[PDB]
Subunit: 57 residues, 3 copies
């Protein structure tokens, strides 16, 4: 079960990289009315980083 929990964390980490690439792609396409979307992307990005670092530890 330990090995499976490590697998799932590595999957979540790799999905977060993919998510960050899609956020970056959307910002390149939008580049102004997006301030609240940027606030929420930033807050949830920081939130997920904290949870991943907690899980890694």
């Amino acid at each position: 079960i330990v090995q499976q929990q490590n697998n799932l964390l590595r999957a979540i980490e790799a999905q977060q990289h993919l998510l960050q690439l899609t956020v970056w792609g959307i910002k390149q396409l939008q580049a102004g009315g997006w301030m609240e979307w940027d606030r929420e992307i930033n807050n949830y990005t920081s939130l997920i980083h904290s949870l991943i670092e907690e899980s890694q530890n």
Copy 2:
């Protein structure tokens, strides 16, 4: 292992919020040929909500 499973669920929840923000961003940029993409986004969004609520319970 219980604490780790809670960590991973909170990470998946925070990633789902980020995913929903990226879907919303893409819909704002597209705003017509997207009907099947919308069907699939809706079905998988409902699917993930059901799995998160199951996991929370």
Copy 3:
């Protein structure tokens, strides 16, 4: 705990489908300077597929 690990894997699988739909949506909007973004999307997509198949097994 086994049932919970299966729940979380199914959630990660459903999120990967959603992620792939958002990548596809972004590529339709961009359709040229995106070569490195495509390389990284491909590498992380392959990485996550390997981790999901490992977890399923």
